Every structure is written in structure tokens, then in C-alpha cells.
Amino acid sequence: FAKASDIAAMIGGEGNVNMLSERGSISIDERTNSLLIRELPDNIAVIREIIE
Amino acid sequence: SLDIPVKQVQIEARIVTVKEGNLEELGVRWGVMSTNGSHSVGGSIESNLWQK
């Protein structure tokens, strides 16, 4: 129901101060409308709940 | 988990236009020219000067 590029630009983005991350990272897969995230297994759950 | 076959979509646009028009005009053109002996009637001054 939403574009993955917009969501990746909102969750991550310019600089690390804005990012909701510490020392991981989002990537986009446009072919299948998906995000690929690498972070602490505790931040994955809150990110998942918000973007759901 | 990423590389999988995707779906295909068929899109069809349709542009329709309809026009109608009506026109009507009526007009009339008439004139008179008469003389009596030292008396005349016309549709201008050059007319009365000509029928002399």
C-alpha cells in the first residue's frame, strides 16, 4: 500500500542524527517493493511495528 | 528470498469526446423610390438627387 522508497527516505535519510539507527542501514529493492535492513535485533521490532 | 518471478499488469486508457452545434440567421433588405412632381421620397439624399 505504500512505496518502499518513501519509507526508506523517512526511516533513514540524510545524516545519522535524523536516522532512527545507530550503526545500521536500510536498502531498497524496487523490483518486489521491499526493504532490506541491518541493525540490532531490538530496533528491528520497533521499526517493524511503526512501519506496519 | 528476493529473486522471484513478478506479476504483470495490463492498462487501458480511453478518451472520448462529443460535440454539437446549431446556428440560425434571418435578414431583410428593402428599398423604395418615388416621385410626384417637385416631391420625392427615397432612402438617402444622393438618391433624391439622382432621381432628378
Q: Are A21 and A43 in contact (CB under 8 A)?
A: yes
Q: Does the beta carbon of A32 lie under 8 angstroms from any beta carbon of chain B? A: yes
Closest CA to A26 of A39, A36, A16: A36
Can you spell out the DSSP letters for B1-52? ---------------------------------EE-SS-EE-SSHHHHHH--
The Cα–Cα gap between B8 and B19 comes to 37
The Cα–Cα gap between A35 and A21 comes to 15
Amino acid at B19: K
Which DSSP symbol is given to A32?
T
Residues of B with CB below 8 A from A29's CB?
A: 2
Residues of A with CB below 8 A from B9's CB?
A: none
Q: Are A32 and B4 in contact (CB under 8 A)?
A: yes
